[PDB]
Amino acid sequence: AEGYEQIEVDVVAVWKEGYVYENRGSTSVDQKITITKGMKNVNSETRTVTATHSIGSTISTGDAFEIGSVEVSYSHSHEESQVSMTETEVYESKVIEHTITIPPTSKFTRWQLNADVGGADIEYMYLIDEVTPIGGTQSIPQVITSRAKIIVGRQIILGKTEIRIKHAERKEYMTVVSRKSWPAATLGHSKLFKFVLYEDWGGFRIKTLNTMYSGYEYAYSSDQGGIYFDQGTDNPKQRWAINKSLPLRHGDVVTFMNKYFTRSGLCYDDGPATNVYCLDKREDKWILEVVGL
Ligand SMILES: [Cl-]
Ligand SMILES: [Mg+2]
Ligand code: NA
Ligand code: NA
Ligand code: NA
Ligand code: NA
Protein backbone atom coordinates (compact mmCIF):
# COMPACT_ATOMS: atom_id res chain seq x y z
CA ALA A 1 0.00 0.00 0.00
CA GLU A 2 1.73 3.17 -1.34
CA GLY A 3 0.45 6.28 0.53
CA TYR A 4 -1.12 5.23 3.84
CA GLU A 5 -0.78 2.20 6.24
CA GLN A 6 -3.34 0.07 8.26
CA ILE A 7 -2.65 -0.70 11.97
CA GLU A 8 -4.68 -2.79 14.46
CA VAL A 9 -4.74 -0.84 17.72
CA ASP A 10 -6.33 -1.50 21.15
CA VAL A 11 -9.40 0.74 21.66
CA VAL A 12 -11.60 1.20 24.76
CA ALA A 13 -15.24 -0.05 24.68
CA VAL A 14 -18.05 -0.11 27.26
CA TRP A 15 -21.51 -1.63 28.03
CA LYS A 16 -23.83 1.29 28.99
CA GLU A 17 -27.46 1.01 30.18
CA GLY A 18 -28.99 2.28 26.91
CA TYR A 19 -32.57 2.49 28.16
CA VAL A 20 -34.50 1.38 31.23
CA TYR A 21 -38.22 1.20 31.97
CA GLU A 22 -39.74 -0.23 35.16
CA ASN A 23 -43.36 -1.45 34.91
CA ARG A 24 -44.47 -1.58 38.57
CA GLY A 25 -48.15 -1.94 37.43
CA SER A 26 -50.42 -4.99 37.07
CA THR A 27 -50.93 -4.41 33.27
CA SER A 28 -48.41 -4.69 30.40
CA VAL A 29 -47.03 -1.43 28.84
CA ASP A 30 -46.04 -0.64 25.19
CA GLN A 31 -42.98 1.62 24.61
CA LYS A 32 -41.51 2.92 21.29
CA ILE A 33 -37.74 2.86 21.96
CA THR A 34 -35.53 4.49 19.29
CA ILE A 35 -31.72 4.27 19.03
CA THR A 36 -29.02 5.56 16.67
CA LYS A 37 -26.32 3.11 15.49
CA GLY A 38 -22.99 4.41 14.14
CA MET A 39 -20.45 7.19 14.86
CA LYS A 40 -21.76 10.35 16.63
CA ASN A 41 -21.54 13.74 14.81
CA VAL A 42 -20.00 11.98 11.77
CA ASN A 43 -18.81 14.13 8.82
CA SER A 44 -20.79 13.48 5.60
CA GLU A 45 -18.05 14.49 3.06
CA THR A 46 -14.87 13.00 4.66
CA ARG A 47 -14.14 9.73 6.49
CA THR A 48 -10.92 11.23 8.06
CA VAL A 49 -11.25 11.71 11.84
CA THR A 50 -8.96 13.94 13.91
CA ALA A 51 -8.16 12.55 17.38
CA THR A 52 -9.49 14.26 20.56
CA HIS A 53 -7.25 11.88 22.62
CA SER A 54 -4.59 9.13 22.17
CA ILE A 55 -4.99 5.49 21.02
CA GLY A 56 -2.06 3.84 22.79
CA SER A 57 1.40 4.32 21.21
CA THR A 58 0.44 4.91 17.52
CA ILE A 59 -2.12 7.77 17.79
CA SER A 60 -1.89 10.98 19.87
CA THR A 61 -4.17 14.07 20.09
CA GLY A 62 -4.59 15.95 16.78
CA ASP A 63 -3.53 12.99 14.54
CA ALA A 64 -5.69 12.44 11.45
CA PHE A 65 -6.74 8.78 10.99
CA GLU A 66 -9.44 6.69 9.23
CA ILE A 67 -11.50 3.64 10.29
CA GLY A 68 -11.32 0.65 9.60
CA SER A 69 -13.18 -2.13 11.44
CA VAL A 70 -13.96 -2.07 15.20
CA GLU A 71 -14.03 -5.56 16.84
CA VAL A 72 -15.29 -6.17 20.39
CA SER A 73 -15.15 -9.43 22.37
CA TYR A 74 -17.52 -9.57 25.31
CA SER A 75 -19.58 -11.92 27.51
CA HIS A 76 -23.22 -12.05 28.63
CA SER A 77 -24.72 -14.90 30.73
CA HIS A 78 -21.38 -16.89 30.67
CA GLU A 79 -21.30 -16.89 26.80
CA GLU A 80 -18.41 -15.15 25.00
CA SER A 81 -19.36 -13.52 21.64
CA GLN A 82 -17.56 -11.31 19.05
CA VAL A 83 -19.28 -8.28 17.37
CA SER A 84 -17.60 -6.60 14.37
CA MET A 85 -18.51 -3.28 12.69
CA THR A 86 -17.33 -2.75 9.08
CA GLU A 87 -16.29 0.58 7.44
CA THR A 88 -19.73 1.45 5.95
CA GLU A 89 -21.39 0.52 9.33
CA VAL A 90 -19.24 2.83 11.57
CA TYR A 91 -19.68 5.89 9.25
CA GLU A 92 -23.34 5.52 8.09
CA SER A 93 -25.53 6.47 11.12
CA LYS A 94 -28.69 4.30 11.07
CA VAL A 95 -31.77 5.01 13.25
CA ILE A 96 -33.48 1.79 14.48
CA GLU A 97 -36.99 1.78 16.04
CA HIS A 98 -39.25 -0.96 17.43
CA THR A 99 -41.98 -1.26 20.10
CA ILE A 100 -41.42 -3.37 23.23
CA THR A 101 -44.20 -4.57 25.55
CA ILE A 102 -42.93 -4.67 29.16
CA PRO A 103 -44.89 -7.22 31.25
CA PRO A 104 -46.38 -6.21 34.60
CA THR A 105 -44.11 -6.20 37.71
CA SER A 106 -40.94 -6.24 35.54
CA LYS A 107 -38.10 -4.05 34.21
CA PHE A 108 -36.90 -3.80 30.59
CA THR A 109 -33.15 -3.05 30.26
CA ARG A 110 -31.42 -2.29 26.90
CA TRP A 111 -27.66 -2.72 27.23
CA GLN A 112 -25.82 -0.57 24.63
CA LEU A 113 -22.22 -1.29 23.49
CA ASN A 114 -20.05 1.71 22.61
CA ALA A 115 -16.44 2.06 21.42
CA ASP A 116 -14.15 5.08 21.64
CA VAL A 117 -11.60 5.14 18.81
CA GLY A 118 -9.52 8.11 20.04
CA GLY A 119 -12.47 10.44 20.58
CA ALA A 120 -14.71 8.86 17.90
CA ASP A 121 -17.73 7.78 19.99
CA ILE A 122 -19.23 4.86 18.03
CA GLU A 123 -22.77 4.39 19.41
CA TYR A 124 -24.67 1.04 19.65
CA MET A 125 -22.01 -1.36 18.21
CA TYR A 126 -24.30 -4.13 19.50
CA LEU A 127 -27.41 -4.55 21.67
CA ILE A 128 -28.67 -6.90 24.43
CA ASP A 129 -32.12 -6.17 25.87
CA GLU A 130 -33.35 -8.13 28.92
CA VAL A 131 -36.65 -8.20 30.83
CA THR A 132 -36.36 -9.06 34.55
CA PRO A 133 -39.11 -9.25 37.17
CA ILE A 134 -39.06 -6.78 40.09
CA GLY A 135 -36.94 -7.56 42.16
CA GLY A 136 -34.92 -10.06 40.14
CA THR A 137 -31.24 -10.21 39.22
CA GLN A 138 -29.67 -9.14 35.92
CA SER A 139 -26.76 -10.36 33.79
CA ILE A 140 -24.46 -7.32 33.38
CA PRO A 141 -22.69 -7.66 29.98
CA GLN A 142 -18.87 -7.43 30.31
CA VAL A 143 -16.40 -6.33 27.60
CA ILE A 144 -13.27 -8.58 27.28
CA THR A 145 -11.29 -7.29 24.26
CA SER A 146 -11.81 -4.10 22.19
CA ARG A 147 -9.65 -3.43 19.08
CA ALA A 148 -9.91 -1.55 15.78
CA LYS A 149 -8.06 -1.49 12.46
CA ILE A 150 -7.20 2.11 11.45
CA ILE A 151 -5.60 3.69 8.38
CA VAL A 152 -2.86 6.32 9.02
CA GLY A 153 -0.11 8.06 7.04
CA ARG A 154 2.78 5.79 6.03
CA GLN A 155 5.83 5.81 8.29
CA ILE A 156 8.73 8.16 7.31
CA ILE A 157 12.00 6.17 7.60
CA LEU A 158 14.78 8.56 8.66
CA GLY A 159 17.54 8.56 6.03
CA LYS A 160 15.59 6.61 3.33
CA THR A 161 12.11 8.16 2.73
CA GLU A 162 12.15 11.09 0.26
CA ILE A 163 9.58 13.78 1.23
CA ARG A 164 8.25 17.25 0.32
CA ILE A 165 7.87 20.02 2.92
CA LYS A 166 4.69 22.07 2.20
CA HIS A 167 3.54 25.16 4.16
CA ALA A 168 0.23 24.57 5.99
CA GLU A 169 -1.24 28.10 5.53
CA ARG A 170 0.18 29.15 2.10
CA LYS A 171 -0.01 25.55 0.64
CA GLU A 172 3.34 25.83 -1.23
CA TYR A 173 6.39 23.48 -1.33
CA MET A 174 9.83 24.42 0.00
CA THR A 175 12.17 24.94 -3.01
CA VAL A 176 15.93 25.64 -3.14
CA VAL A 177 17.35 28.71 -5.01
CA SER A 178 20.65 30.61 -5.06
CA ARG A 179 20.72 33.49 -2.51
CA LYS A 180 24.06 35.35 -2.09
CA SER A 181 26.35 32.49 -3.43
CA TRP A 182 25.06 29.16 -1.85
CA PRO A 183 21.70 27.24 -1.95
CA ALA A 184 18.89 28.90 0.07
CA ALA A 185 15.34 27.74 0.82
CA THR A 186 12.39 29.61 -0.83
CA LEU A 187 8.66 28.78 -1.34
CA GLY A 188 7.18 27.74 -4.72
CA HIS A 189 4.84 25.28 -6.50
CA SER A 190 7.54 22.87 -7.85
CA LYS A 191 6.97 19.17 -6.90
CA LEU A 192 10.47 18.18 -8.26
CA PHE A 193 12.20 19.47 -5.08
CA LYS A 194 12.41 16.68 -2.44
CA PHE A 195 14.15 16.29 0.97
CA VAL A 196 15.16 13.46 3.36
CA LEU A 197 15.06 13.70 7.20
CA TYR A 198 17.71 12.39 9.70
CA GLU A 199 18.07 12.27 13.51
CA ASP A 200 21.30 12.29 15.60
CA TRP A 201 22.44 13.30 19.16
CA GLY A 202 22.20 17.00 18.18
CA GLY A 203 18.71 16.79 16.63
CA PHE A 204 16.84 16.49 13.31
CA ARG A 205 18.31 17.57 9.93
CA ILE A 206 16.65 18.66 6.62
CA LYS A 207 18.85 17.30 3.76
CA THR A 208 17.91 18.49 0.22
CA LEU A 209 18.24 16.10 -2.75
CA ASN A 210 18.14 19.01 -5.30
CA THR A 211 21.29 20.95 -4.30
CA MET A 212 22.76 23.50 -6.74
CA TYR A 213 26.32 23.32 -5.32
CA SER A 214 27.25 19.66 -4.47
CA GLY A 215 27.98 18.98 -0.78
CA TYR A 216 26.04 21.99 0.59
CA GLU A 217 22.79 20.10 1.44
CA TYR A 218 21.79 20.29 5.20
CA ALA A 219 19.35 23.16 6.04
CA TYR A 220 20.68 25.69 8.58
CA SER A 221 19.81 29.08 10.13
CA SER A 222 22.13 32.03 9.42
CA ASP A 223 22.83 34.96 11.78
CA GLN A 224 20.80 37.32 9.48
CA GLY A 225 17.76 34.95 9.95
CA GLY A 226 17.57 33.38 6.47
CA ILE A 227 17.70 29.67 5.61
CA TYR A 228 20.66 28.19 3.71
CA PHE A 229 21.94 24.65 3.00
CA ASP A 230 25.46 23.77 4.31
CA GLN A 231 27.81 20.71 4.40
CA GLY A 232 27.47 18.04 7.11
CA THR A 233 28.71 19.32 10.50
CA ASP A 234 27.97 18.88 14.23
CA ASN A 235 27.01 22.66 14.29
CA PRO A 236 23.62 22.98 16.11
CA LYS A 237 22.59 25.77 13.65
CA GLN A 238 21.95 22.99 11.02
CA ARG A 239 20.09 20.68 13.56
CA TRP A 240 16.36 21.06 14.29
CA ALA A 241 13.63 20.10 16.79
CA ILE A 242 10.35 18.50 15.60
CA ASN A 243 7.30 18.88 17.94
CA LYS A 244 5.79 15.47 16.96
CA SER A 245 7.27 12.31 18.58
CA LEU A 246 8.75 9.45 16.52
CA PRO A 247 7.95 7.63 14.25
CA LEU A 248 7.02 10.49 11.86
CA ARG A 249 4.27 9.83 9.32
CA HIS A 250 2.92 11.09 5.96
CA GLY A 251 0.68 14.18 6.12
CA ASP A 252 1.94 15.09 9.65
CA VAL A 253 1.61 18.79 10.48
CA VAL A 254 4.99 19.57 12.17
CA THR A 255 7.00 22.65 13.28
CA PHE A 256 10.85 22.98 13.04
CA MET A 257 12.57 24.81 15.96
CA ASN A 258 16.33 25.54 15.58
CA LYS A 259 18.58 23.91 18.21
CA TYR A 260 21.10 26.80 18.37
CA PHE A 261 18.45 29.57 18.24
CA THR A 262 16.00 27.89 20.73
CA ARG A 263 13.16 30.52 20.54
CA SER A 264 13.59 30.94 16.74
CA GLY A 265 11.71 28.52 14.42
CA LEU A 266 11.29 27.80 10.67
CA CYS A 267 8.65 30.10 9.09
CA TYR A 268 7.58 32.18 6.06
CA ASP A 269 8.74 35.83 5.81
CA ASP A 270 9.01 37.62 2.41
CA GLY A 271 12.61 38.91 2.46
CA PRO A 272 14.67 40.48 -0.37
CA ALA A 273 15.18 37.31 -2.52
CA THR A 274 13.92 34.27 -0.54
CA ASN A 275 10.81 33.89 1.69
CA VAL A 276 11.66 30.86 4.01
CA TYR A 277 13.24 32.26 7.23
CA CYS A 278 13.95 31.18 10.85
CA LEU A 279 12.74 34.09 13.11
CA ASP A 280 12.40 34.63 16.91
CA LYS A 281 9.08 33.61 18.62
CA ARG A 282 7.74 32.26 15.22
CA GLU A 283 6.85 28.60 14.51
CA ASP A 284 4.76 28.21 11.32
CA LYS A 285 3.16 24.84 10.55
CA TRP A 286 4.74 22.55 7.87
CA ILE A 287 3.21 19.36 6.39
CA LEU A 288 5.41 16.29 5.74
CA GLU A 289 4.39 14.73 2.38
CA VAL A 290 5.86 11.33 1.34
CA VAL A 291 6.72 10.91 -2.39
CA GLY A 292 5.48 8.08 -4.63
CA LEU A 293 5.00 10.34 -7.75
CL1 LIG B 1 29.07 28.01 -1.71
MG1 LIG C 1 -16.29 0.23 32.34
NA1 NA D 1 -3.44 -4.78 18.64
NA1 NA E 1 -12.54 -2.06 27.05
NA1 NA F 1 -28.05 -2.93 37.33
NA1 NA G 1 1.06 28.63 11.67
Numbering used by the authors: 6 to 298
Publication passage describing the model:
Lysenin from the earthworm Eisenia fetida is a pore-forming protein that specifically interacts with sphingomyelin (SM) and may confer innate immunity against parasites by attacking their membranes (Bruhn et al., 2006; Cooper et al., 2001). The structure reveals that lysenin has two domains. The topology of the lysenin structural fold establishes it as a member of the aerolysin family of pore-forming proteins (Szczesny et al., 2011), which appears thus to be conserved from bacteria to annelids. Here we report the crystal structure of lysenin alone, and in complex with the sphingomyelin headgroup phosphocholine (POC), and with SM itself.
The crystal structure of lysenin was first determined in space group P6522, with one molecule per asymmetric unit (a.u.), by multiple isomorphous replacement with anomalous scattering (MIRAS, one SeMet and one Hg derivative) and then in space group P1 with four molecules per a.u. by molecular replacement. The C terminus of lysenin is composed of a β-trefoil motif with a six-stranded antiparallel β-barrel capped on one end by three two-stranded hairpins and a single-turn 310 helix. The five crystallographically independent copies of the molecule (see Experimental Procedures and Table 1), define an ∼45° arc that is subtended by the C-terminal domains hinging at residues 159–168. Residue Gln229 is the gate regulating access to the POC binding pocket: in the apo forms of lysenin, Gln229 is in a closed conformation, blocking the entrance to the POC binding site, but has opened in the POC bound state. Lys185 aids in defining the gate, as it is in a different conformer in the apo form, preventing interaction with the phosphate moiety. The elongated N-terminal domain consists of a 310 helix and 10 β strands, six of which belong to a highly twisted antiparallel β sheet.
